[PDB]
Amino acid sequence: GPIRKVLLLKEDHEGLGISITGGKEHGVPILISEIHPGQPADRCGGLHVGDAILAVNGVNLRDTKHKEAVTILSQQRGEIEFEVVYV
Amino acid sequence: NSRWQVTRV
């Protein structure tokens, strides 16, 4: 439905708490495939399986290979703004 | 193959 902008807060050493799939080499968006219980995405809320990640902290993810999205997501620090839309 | 990568971050 609507595009949402959601903030995730975590410690440097924590993971985001999401699994992603898709990517340019598969012809599909970066899609959230799992939200892991008790981890930052689950605690903060607003991110769900089936969301496409359009951008993370202002960085466009719409034409990234899978591993490029993994890299950009893995480089996040403590505050992370997600731009997502359920597809 | 056709299978998609899945990665936890």
Side-chain angles (χ1 to χ4, degrees), chain A residues 12-80:
Chain A
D12 265 351
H13 70 295
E14 285 179 290
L16 295 165
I18 72 181
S19 291
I20 59 163
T21 188
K24 175 205 247 303
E25 62 266 68
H26 306 297
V28 300
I30 304 300
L31 295 163
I32 296 181
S33 67
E34 190 171 354
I35 300 291
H36 300 279
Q39 296 298 346
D42 186 46
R43 301 197 306 261
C44 287
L47 300 176
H48 312 286
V49 177
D51 284 339
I53 305 179
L54 309 178
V56 53
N57 266 339
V59 178
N60 189 9
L61 288 197
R62 294 179 73 204
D63 207 49
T64 56
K65 295 180 175 207
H66 182 89
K67 74 173 183 178
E68 294 164 358
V70 172
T71 291
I72 294 159
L73 291 165
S74 297
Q75 289 293 307
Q76 300 307 318
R77 296 289 304 257
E79 307 165 41
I80 307 98

Short mmCIF file of all heavy atoms in Angstrom, two decimals, chain A residues 12-80:
data_model
loop_
_atom_site.label_atom_id
_atom_site.label_comp_id
_atom_site.label_asym_id
_atom_site.label_seq_id
_atom_site.Cartn_x
_atom_site.Cartn_y
_atom_site.Cartn_z
N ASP A 12 25.56 -0.75 18.05
CA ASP A 12 26.46 -1.01 16.93
C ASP A 12 26.61 -2.49 16.65
O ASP A 12 26.61 -2.92 15.49
CB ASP A 12 27.84 -0.41 17.22
CG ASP A 12 28.01 0.97 16.63
OD1 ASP A 12 27.13 1.41 15.86
OD2 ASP A 12 29.03 1.61 16.95
N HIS A 13 26.79 -3.20 17.72
CA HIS A 13 27.00 -4.66 17.61
C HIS A 13 25.82 -5.63 17.28
O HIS A 13 25.88 -6.88 16.93
CB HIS A 13 27.77 -5.17 18.82
CG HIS A 13 26.95 -5.14 20.06
ND1 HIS A 13 26.52 -3.96 20.62
CD2 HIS A 13 26.47 -6.12 20.84
CE1 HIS A 13 25.81 -4.22 21.68
NE2 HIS A 13 25.75 -5.53 21.84
N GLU A 14 24.63 -5.03 17.37
CA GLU A 14 23.42 -5.78 17.05
C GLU A 14 23.23 -5.87 15.54
O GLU A 14 23.60 -4.96 14.79
CB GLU A 14 22.19 -5.12 17.65
CG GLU A 14 22.01 -5.31 19.15
CD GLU A 14 20.78 -4.59 19.66
OE1 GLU A 14 20.78 -3.34 19.69
OE2 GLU A 14 19.79 -5.27 20.02
N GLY A 15 22.64 -6.98 15.09
CA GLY A 15 22.12 -7.03 13.74
C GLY A 15 20.81 -6.26 13.64
O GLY A 15 20.22 -5.86 14.64
N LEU A 16 20.36 -6.05 12.40
CA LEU A 16 19.07 -5.39 12.21
C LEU A 16 17.92 -6.27 12.64
O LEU A 16 16.87 -5.77 13.06
CB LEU A 16 18.88 -4.99 10.74
CG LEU A 16 19.86 -3.94 10.22
CD1 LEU A 16 19.84 -3.91 8.70
CD2 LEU A 16 19.49 -2.58 10.79
N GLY A 17 18.08 -7.59 12.54
CA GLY A 17 17.00 -8.51 12.84
C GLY A 17 16.07 -8.78 11.69
O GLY A 17 14.87 -9.02 11.92
N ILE A 18 16.55 -8.73 10.46
CA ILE A 18 15.74 -9.05 9.29
C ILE A 18 16.54 -9.96 8.39
O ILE A 18 17.78 -9.93 8.37
CB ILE A 18 15.29 -7.79 8.50
CG1 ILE A 18 16.48 -7.17 7.76
CG2 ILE A 18 14.63 -6.78 9.42
CD1 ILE A 18 16.13 -5.90 6.98
N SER A 19 15.83 -10.80 7.65
CA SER A 19 16.40 -11.51 6.52
C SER A 19 15.80 -10.93 5.25
O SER A 19 14.62 -10.60 5.21
CB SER A 19 16.14 -13.02 6.60
OG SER A 19 16.87 -13.60 7.68
N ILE A 20 16.63 -10.77 4.22
CA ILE A 20 16.17 -10.21 2.96
C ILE A 20 16.39 -11.23 1.86
O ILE A 20 17.27 -12.10 1.94
CB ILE A 20 16.87 -8.88 2.61
CG1 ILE A 20 18.39 -9.07 2.51
CG2 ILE A 20 16.52 -7.79 3.62
CD1 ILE A 20 19.07 -7.93 1.77
N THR A 21 15.60 -11.10 0.80
CA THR A 21 15.78 -11.90 -0.40
C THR A 21 15.60 -10.99 -1.61
O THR A 21 15.46 -9.77 -1.48
CB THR A 21 14.82 -13.10 -0.39
OG1 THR A 21 15.14 -13.98 -1.47
CG2 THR A 21 13.37 -12.63 -0.52
N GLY A 22 15.62 -11.58 -2.80
CA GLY A 22 15.50 -10.80 -4.01
C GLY A 22 16.79 -10.08 -4.39
O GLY A 22 17.88 -10.38 -3.90
N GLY A 23 16.65 -9.14 -5.31
CA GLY A 23 17.77 -8.38 -5.82
C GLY A 23 17.80 -8.37 -7.33
O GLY A 23 17.13 -9.15 -8.00
N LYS A 24 18.62 -7.45 -7.86
CA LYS A 24 18.61 -7.17 -9.30
C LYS A 24 18.87 -8.42 -10.13
O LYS A 24 18.28 -8.59 -11.20
CB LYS A 24 19.64 -6.09 -9.62
CG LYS A 24 19.80 -5.81 -11.11
CD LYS A 24 21.18 -5.25 -11.42
CE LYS A 24 21.10 -3.81 -11.88
NZ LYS A 24 20.21 -3.67 -13.07
N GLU A 25 19.75 -9.31 -9.67
CA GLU A 25 20.07 -10.47 -10.49
C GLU A 25 18.90 -11.43 -10.60
O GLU A 25 18.87 -12.24 -11.54
CB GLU A 25 21.30 -11.21 -9.94
CG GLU A 25 21.16 -11.78 -8.54
CD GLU A 25 21.70 -10.83 -7.49
OE1 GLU A 25 21.08 -9.77 -7.29
OE2 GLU A 25 22.74 -11.14 -6.88
N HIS A 26 17.92 -11.34 -9.70
CA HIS A 26 16.72 -12.16 -9.77
C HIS A 26 15.54 -11.41 -10.38
O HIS A 26 14.46 -12.00 -10.54
CB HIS A 26 16.35 -12.66 -8.36
CG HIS A 26 17.46 -13.37 -7.66
ND1 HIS A 26 18.01 -14.55 -8.12
CD2 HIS A 26 18.13 -13.07 -6.52
CE1 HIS A 26 18.97 -14.94 -7.30
NE2 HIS A 26 19.07 -14.06 -6.32
N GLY A 27 15.71 -10.14 -10.73
CA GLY A 27 14.65 -9.36 -11.33
C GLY A 27 13.59 -8.88 -10.37
O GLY A 27 12.48 -8.55 -10.81
N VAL A 28 13.88 -8.82 -9.08
CA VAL A 28 12.86 -8.48 -8.09
C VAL A 28 13.45 -7.53 -7.06
O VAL A 28 14.68 -7.45 -6.90
CB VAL A 28 12.29 -9.73 -7.39
CG1 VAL A 28 11.65 -10.67 -8.41
CG2 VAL A 28 13.37 -10.45 -6.65
N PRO A 29 12.60 -6.79 -6.35
CA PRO A 29 13.11 -5.87 -5.33
C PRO A 29 13.79 -6.62 -4.20
O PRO A 29 13.68 -7.83 -4.03
CB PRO A 29 11.85 -5.16 -4.81
CG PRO A 29 10.81 -5.40 -5.84
CD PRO A 29 11.14 -6.72 -6.47
N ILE A 30 14.52 -5.85 -3.39
CA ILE A 30 14.94 -6.34 -2.09
C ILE A 30 13.70 -6.50 -1.22
O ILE A 30 13.01 -5.53 -0.92
CB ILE A 30 15.96 -5.40 -1.44
CG1 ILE A 30 17.15 -5.19 -2.38
CG2 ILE A 30 16.39 -5.96 -0.09
CD1 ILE A 30 17.90 -6.45 -2.73
N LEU A 31 13.40 -7.74 -0.84
CA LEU A 31 12.21 -8.09 -0.09
C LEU A 31 12.60 -8.64 1.27
O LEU A 31 13.52 -9.45 1.38
CB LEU A 31 11.38 -9.14 -0.84
CG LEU A 31 10.79 -8.68 -2.17
CD1 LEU A 31 10.36 -9.88 -3.00
CD2 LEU A 31 9.60 -7.76 -1.90
N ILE A 32 11.88 -8.22 2.30
CA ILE A 32 12.04 -8.80 3.63
C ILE A 32 11.40 -10.18 3.64
O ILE A 32 10.22 -10.33 3.29
CB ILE A 32 11.44 -7.90 4.72
CG1 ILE A 32 12.19 -6.56 4.77
CG2 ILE A 32 11.46 -8.60 6.07
CD1 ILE A 32 11.67 -5.61 5.84
N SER A 33 12.17 -11.20 4.02
CA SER A 33 11.65 -12.57 4.06
C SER A 33 11.44 -13.09 5.48
O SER A 33 10.72 -14.09 5.64
CB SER A 33 12.59 -13.51 3.30
OG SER A 33 13.85 -13.64 3.94
N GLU A 34 12.02 -12.45 6.49
CA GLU A 34 11.81 -12.84 7.87
C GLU A 34 12.09 -11.65 8.78
O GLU A 34 13.00 -10.86 8.51
CB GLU A 34 12.71 -14.03 8.27
CG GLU A 34 12.36 -14.61 9.63
CD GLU A 34 13.08 -15.91 9.94
OE1 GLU A 34 13.78 -16.44 9.05
OE2 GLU A 34 12.95 -16.40 11.08
N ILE A 35 11.30 -11.52 9.85
CA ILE A 35 11.56 -10.60 10.94
C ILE A 35 11.87 -11.45 12.17
O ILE A 35 11.05 -12.26 12.59
CB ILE A 35 10.36 -9.67 11.22
CG1 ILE A 35 10.02 -8.82 9.99
CG2 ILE A 35 10.64 -8.78 12.43
CD1 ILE A 35 11.06 -7.77 9.66
N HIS A 36 13.07 -11.27 12.72
CA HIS A 36 13.50 -12.22 13.75
C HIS A 36 13.06 -11.75 15.13
O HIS A 36 13.34 -10.61 15.50
CB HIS A 36 15.00 -12.40 13.69
CG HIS A 36 15.47 -12.94 12.37
ND1 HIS A 36 15.41 -14.27 12.05
CD2 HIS A 36 15.94 -12.30 11.27
CE1 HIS A 36 15.85 -14.45 10.82
NE2 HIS A 36 16.18 -13.27 10.32
N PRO A 37 12.38 -12.60 15.89
CA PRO A 37 11.74 -12.13 17.13
C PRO A 37 12.76 -11.59 18.13
O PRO A 37 13.85 -12.13 18.29
CB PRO A 37 11.04 -13.39 17.67
CG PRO A 37 10.82 -14.23 16.47
CD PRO A 37 12.03 -14.00 15.60
N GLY A 38 12.38 -10.49 18.78
CA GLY A 38 13.18 -9.91 19.83
C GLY A 38 14.36 -9.08 19.37
O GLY A 38 15.03 -8.47 20.21
N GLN A 39 14.62 -9.02 18.07
CA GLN A 39 15.72 -8.25 17.51
C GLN A 39 15.25 -6.85 17.17
O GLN A 39 14.05 -6.55 17.27
CB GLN A 39 16.29 -9.00 16.30
CG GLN A 39 16.92 -10.35 16.63
CD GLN A 39 18.12 -10.24 17.57
OE1 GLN A 39 18.66 -9.16 17.78
NE2 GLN A 39 18.54 -11.38 18.12
N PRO A 40 16.15 -5.93 16.79
CA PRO A 40 15.74 -4.52 16.64
C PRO A 40 14.55 -4.27 15.71
O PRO A 40 13.68 -3.46 16.07
CB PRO A 40 17.01 -3.85 16.11
CG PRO A 40 18.10 -4.62 16.75
CD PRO A 40 17.63 -6.05 16.73
N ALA A 41 14.46 -4.91 14.54
CA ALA A 41 13.32 -4.65 13.67
C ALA A 41 12.01 -5.06 14.33
O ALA A 41 10.99 -4.37 14.18
CB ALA A 41 13.48 -5.38 12.34
N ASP A 42 12.02 -6.17 15.05
CA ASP A 42 10.82 -6.62 15.74
C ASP A 42 10.48 -5.71 16.92
O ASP A 42 9.31 -5.36 17.12
CB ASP A 42 11.00 -8.07 16.20
CG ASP A 42 9.74 -8.65 16.79
OD1 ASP A 42 8.66 -8.47 16.18
OD2 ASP A 42 9.82 -9.29 17.86
N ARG A 43 11.49 -5.32 17.70
CA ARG A 43 11.25 -4.45 18.85
C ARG A 43 10.75 -3.08 18.41
O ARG A 43 9.82 -2.52 19.01
CB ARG A 43 12.52 -4.29 19.69
CG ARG A 43 13.09 -5.58 20.23
CD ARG A 43 14.09 -5.31 21.36
NE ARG A 43 15.16 -4.38 21.00
CZ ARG A 43 16.38 -4.76 20.64
NH1 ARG A 43 16.69 -6.05 20.56
NH2 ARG A 43 17.30 -3.85 20.34
N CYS A 44 11.36 -2.51 17.37
CA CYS A 44 10.98 -1.17 16.95
C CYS A 44 9.66 -1.18 16.20
O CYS A 44 8.88 -0.22 16.31
CB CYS A 44 12.07 -0.55 16.09
SG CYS A 44 13.53 -0.05 17.03
N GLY A 45 9.40 -2.23 15.43
CA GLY A 45 8.17 -2.34 14.67
C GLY A 45 8.26 -1.65 13.32
O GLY A 45 9.20 -0.91 13.01
N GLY A 46 7.24 -1.89 12.50
CA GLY A 46 7.07 -1.16 11.26
C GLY A 46 7.70 -1.78 10.04
O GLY A 46 7.61 -1.20 8.96
N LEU A 47 8.36 -2.93 10.20
CA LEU A 47 9.00 -3.66 9.11
C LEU A 47 8.48 -5.08 9.12
O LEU A 47 8.44 -5.71 10.18
CB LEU A 47 10.53 -3.67 9.26
CG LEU A 47 11.21 -2.31 9.28
CD1 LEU A 47 12.71 -2.46 9.55
CD2 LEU A 47 11.00 -1.63 7.95
N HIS A 48 8.09 -5.60 7.95
CA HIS A 48 7.37 -6.86 7.90
C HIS A 48 7.79 -7.68 6.69
O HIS A 48 8.28 -7.15 5.69
CB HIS A 48 5.86 -6.62 7.86
CG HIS A 48 5.39 -5.65 8.89
ND1 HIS A 48 5.32 -5.97 10.23
CD2 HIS A 48 5.04 -4.35 8.80
CE1 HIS A 48 4.91 -4.91 10.91
NE2 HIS A 48 4.73 -3.91 10.06
N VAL A 49 7.59 -9.00 6.80
CA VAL A 49 7.79 -9.88 5.66
C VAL A 49 6.90 -9.44 4.51
O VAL A 49 5.71 -9.14 4.70
CB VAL A 49 7.48 -11.34 6.06
CG1 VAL A 49 7.62 -12.26 4.86
CG2 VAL A 49 8.39 -11.78 7.20
N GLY A 50 7.47 -9.40 3.31
CA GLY A 50 6.75 -8.95 2.14
C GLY A 50 6.93 -7.48 1.82
O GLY A 50 6.48 -7.04 0.75
N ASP A 51 7.54 -6.72 2.72
CA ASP A 51 7.92 -5.35 2.41
C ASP A 51 9.08 -5.34 1.42
O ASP A 51 10.04 -6.10 1.58
CB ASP A 51 8.34 -4.60 3.67
CG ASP A 51 7.18 -4.19 4.55
OD1 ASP A 51 6.04 -4.11 4.05
OD2 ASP A 51 7.42 -3.92 5.74
N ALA A 52 8.99 -4.47 0.42
CA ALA A 52 10.14 -4.15 -0.40
C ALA A 52 10.88 -2.99 0.25
O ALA A 52 10.25 -2.02 0.69
CB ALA A 52 9.72 -3.77 -1.83
N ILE A 53 12.21 -3.07 0.31
CA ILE A 53 13.00 -1.99 0.88
C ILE A 53 13.43 -1.08 -0.26
O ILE A 53 14.24 -1.46 -1.10
CB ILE A 53 14.22 -2.51 1.66
CG1 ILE A 53 13.77 -3.50 2.73
CG2 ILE A 53 14.97 -1.33 2.28
CD1 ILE A 53 14.93 -4.09 3.55
N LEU A 54 12.88 0.14 -0.28
CA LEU A 54 13.20 1.06 -1.35
C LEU A 54 14.49 1.81 -1.06
O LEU A 54 15.26 2.11 -1.99
CB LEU A 54 12.05 2.05 -1.55
CG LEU A 54 10.68 1.40 -1.70
CD1 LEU A 54 9.59 2.46 -1.85
CD2 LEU A 54 10.68 0.44 -2.88
N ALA A 55 14.74 2.13 0.20
CA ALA A 55 15.92 2.91 0.55
C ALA A 55 16.20 2.71 2.03
O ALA A 55 15.30 2.42 2.82
CB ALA A 55 15.74 4.40 0.23
N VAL A 56 17.48 2.84 2.39
CA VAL A 56 17.90 2.71 3.78
C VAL A 56 18.81 3.90 4.08
O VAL A 56 19.78 4.14 3.35
CB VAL A 56 18.59 1.37 4.04
CG1 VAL A 56 19.73 1.13 3.06
CG2 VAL A 56 19.09 1.29 5.46
N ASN A 57 18.47 4.66 5.12
CA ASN A 57 19.12 5.92 5.46
C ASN A 57 19.39 6.77 4.23
O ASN A 57 20.48 7.33 4.07
CB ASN A 57 20.42 5.67 6.23
CG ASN A 57 20.20 5.71 7.72
OD1 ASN A 57 19.21 6.30 8.19
ND2 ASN A 57 21.10 5.10 8.48
N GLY A 58 18.40 6.88 3.35
CA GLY A 58 18.50 7.72 2.18
C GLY A 58 19.25 7.12 1.01
O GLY A 58 19.44 7.82 0.00
N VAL A 59 19.68 5.86 1.09
CA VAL A 59 20.42 5.20 0.02
C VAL A 59 19.46 4.31 -0.76
O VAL A 59 18.89 3.36 -0.21
CB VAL A 59 21.60 4.39 0.57
CG1 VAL A 59 22.33 3.68 -0.56
CG2 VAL A 59 22.55 5.29 1.35
N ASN A 60 19.32 4.60 -2.06
CA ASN A 60 18.43 3.84 -2.92
C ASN A 60 18.86 2.38 -3.03
O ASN A 60 20.01 2.07 -3.37
CB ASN A 60 18.42 4.49 -4.31
CG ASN A 60 17.37 3.91 -5.23
OD1 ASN A 60 16.52 3.13 -4.81
ND2 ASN A 60 17.40 4.32 -6.49
N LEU A 61 17.92 1.46 -2.77
CA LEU A 61 18.19 0.03 -2.91
C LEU A 61 17.46 -0.59 -4.10
O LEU A 61 17.53 -1.81 -4.28
CB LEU A 61 17.79 -0.73 -1.64
CG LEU A 61 18.62 -0.60 -0.36
CD1 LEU A 61 18.29 -1.75 0.59
CD2 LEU A 61 20.11 -0.56 -0.66
N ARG A 62 16.78 0.20 -4.93
CA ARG A 62 15.89 -0.41 -5.91
C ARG A 62 16.61 -1.08 -7.07
O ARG A 62 16.01 -1.93 -7.74
CB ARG A 62 14.91 0.64 -6.44
CG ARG A 62 13.95 1.12 -5.36
CD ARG A 62 13.02 2.17 -5.91
NE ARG A 62 12.02 1.60 -6.79
CZ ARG A 62 11.39 2.29 -7.74
NH1 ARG A 62 11.69 3.57 -7.94
NH2 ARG A 62 10.48 1.69 -8.50
N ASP A 63 17.88 -0.76 -7.33
CA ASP A 63 18.57 -1.44 -8.42
C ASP A 63 19.88 -2.05 -7.95
O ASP A 63 20.89 -2.04 -8.66
CB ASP A 63 18.79 -0.49 -9.60
CG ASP A 63 18.88 -1.23 -10.93
OD1 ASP A 63 17.99 -2.07 -11.21
OD2 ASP A 63 19.85 -0.99 -11.68
N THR A 64 19.88 -2.60 -6.74
CA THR A 64 21.06 -3.23 -6.17
C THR A 64 20.99 -4.74 -6.37
O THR A 64 19.92 -5.34 -6.36
CB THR A 64 21.17 -2.93 -4.67
OG1 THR A 64 19.97 -3.34 -4.00
CG2 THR A 64 21.39 -1.44 -4.44
N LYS A 65 22.16 -5.34 -6.59
CA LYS A 65 22.25 -6.79 -6.47
C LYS A 65 22.00 -7.19 -5.03
O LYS A 65 22.13 -6.38 -4.11
CB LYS A 65 23.62 -7.30 -6.92
CG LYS A 65 23.93 -7.08 -8.37
CD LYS A 65 25.31 -7.61 -8.72
CE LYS A 65 25.55 -7.48 -10.22
NZ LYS A 65 26.52 -8.48 -10.73
N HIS A 66 21.66 -8.46 -4.83
CA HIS A 66 21.42 -8.96 -3.48
C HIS A 66 22.57 -8.60 -2.54
O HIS A 66 22.37 -8.05 -1.46
CB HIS A 66 21.21 -10.47 -3.48
CG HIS A 66 20.91 -11.03 -2.13
ND1 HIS A 66 19.63 -11.12 -1.63
CD2 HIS A 66 21.73 -11.47 -1.15
CE1 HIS A 66 19.67 -11.62 -0.41
NE2 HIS A 66 20.93 -11.85 -0.09
N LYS A 67 23.81 -8.91 -2.96
CA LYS A 67 24.94 -8.70 -2.06
C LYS A 67 25.21 -7.22 -1.82
O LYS A 67 25.78 -6.86 -0.79
CB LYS A 67 26.19 -9.39 -2.62
CG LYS A 67 26.81 -8.67 -3.81
CD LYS A 67 28.13 -9.30 -4.21
CE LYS A 67 28.80 -8.54 -5.35
NZ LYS A 67 30.12 -9.15 -5.71
N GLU A 68 24.83 -6.37 -2.77
CA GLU A 68 25.00 -4.93 -2.57
C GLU A 68 24.06 -4.43 -1.49
O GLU A 68 24.45 -3.60 -0.65
CB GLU A 68 24.78 -4.21 -3.90
CG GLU A 68 25.87 -4.55 -4.92
CD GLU A 68 25.52 -4.17 -6.34
OE1 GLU A 68 24.40 -3.67 -6.56
OE2 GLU A 68 26.36 -4.38 -7.23
N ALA A 69 22.82 -4.93 -1.48
CA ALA A 69 21.89 -4.57 -0.41
C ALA A 69 22.38 -5.10 0.93
O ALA A 69 22.27 -4.41 1.95
CB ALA A 69 20.50 -5.10 -0.72
N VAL A 70 22.93 -6.32 0.95
CA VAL A 70 23.48 -6.87 2.18
C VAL A 70 24.57 -5.97 2.73
O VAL A 70 24.64 -5.71 3.94
CB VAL A 70 24.00 -8.30 1.94
CG1 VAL A 70 24.74 -8.80 3.17
CG2 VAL A 70 22.84 -9.23 1.58
N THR A 71 25.45 -5.50 1.85
CA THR A 71 26.54 -4.62 2.26
C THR A 71 26.02 -3.32 2.83
O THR A 71 26.41 -2.90 3.93
CB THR A 71 27.45 -4.37 1.06
OG1 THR A 71 28.13 -5.58 0.72
CG2 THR A 71 28.47 -3.28 1.38
N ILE A 72 25.12 -2.65 2.11
CA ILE A 72 24.61 -1.36 2.57
C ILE A 72 23.87 -1.53 3.89
O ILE A 72 24.01 -0.71 4.80
CB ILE A 72 23.73 -0.73 1.47
CG1 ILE A 72 24.60 -0.39 0.26
CG2 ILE A 72 23.01 0.51 2.01
CD1 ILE A 72 23.84 -0.23 -1.02
N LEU A 73 23.09 -2.61 4.02
CA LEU A 73 22.39 -2.85 5.28
C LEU A 73 23.36 -3.18 6.40
O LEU A 73 23.16 -2.77 7.55
CB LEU A 73 21.37 -3.97 5.11
CG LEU A 73 20.19 -3.58 4.22
CD1 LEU A 73 19.42 -4.82 3.78
CD2 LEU A 73 19.28 -2.61 4.96
N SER A 74 24.42 -3.93 6.09
CA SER A 74 25.37 -4.35 7.11
C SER A 74 26.22 -3.20 7.63
O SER A 74 26.75 -3.29 8.74
CB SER A 74 26.26 -5.47 6.57
OG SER A 74 25.50 -6.62 6.25
N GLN A 75 26.37 -2.14 6.85
CA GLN A 75 27.20 -1.01 7.26
C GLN A 75 26.48 -0.02 8.17
O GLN A 75 27.09 0.95 8.61
CB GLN A 75 27.72 -0.28 6.02
CG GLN A 75 28.76 -1.07 5.26
CD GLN A 75 30.02 -1.23 6.06
OE1 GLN A 75 30.59 -0.26 6.54
NE2 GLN A 75 30.46 -2.47 6.24
N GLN A 76 25.20 -0.26 8.48
CA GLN A 76 24.46 0.65 9.34
C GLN A 76 25.04 0.66 10.75
O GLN A 76 25.71 -0.29 11.19
CB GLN A 76 22.99 0.26 9.36
CG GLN A 76 22.34 0.32 7.98
CD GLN A 76 22.53 1.66 7.29
OE1 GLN A 76 22.43 2.71 7.92
NE2 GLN A 76 22.83 1.62 6.00
N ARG A 77 24.80 1.77 11.47
CA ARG A 77 25.36 1.95 12.81
C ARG A 77 24.22 1.87 13.82
O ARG A 77 23.81 0.76 14.20
CB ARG A 77 26.15 3.26 12.90
CG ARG A 77 27.40 3.33 12.02
CD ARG A 77 28.52 2.42 12.50
NE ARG A 77 28.90 2.68 13.88
CZ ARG A 77 29.99 3.35 14.25
NH1 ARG A 77 30.82 3.83 13.32
NH2 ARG A 77 30.25 3.54 15.53
N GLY A 78 23.69 3.00 14.29
CA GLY A 78 22.76 2.97 15.40
C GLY A 78 21.34 3.42 15.09
O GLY A 78 20.40 2.94 15.71
N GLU A 79 21.19 4.37 14.16
CA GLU A 79 19.88 4.85 13.74
C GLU A 79 19.74 4.59 12.26
O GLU A 79 20.63 4.96 11.48
CB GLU A 79 19.69 6.35 14.00
CG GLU A 79 19.98 6.82 15.41
CD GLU A 79 20.14 8.33 15.48
OE1 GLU A 79 19.36 9.04 14.81
OE2 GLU A 79 21.05 8.80 16.18
N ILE A 80 18.66 3.94 11.86
CA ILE A 80 18.52 3.49 10.48
C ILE A 80 17.09 3.78 10.03
O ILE A 80 16.14 3.18 10.55
CB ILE A 80 18.84 2.00 10.31
CG1 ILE A 80 20.21 1.65 10.90
CG2 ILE A 80 18.81 1.66 8.86
CD1 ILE A 80 20.17 1.05 12.30
#
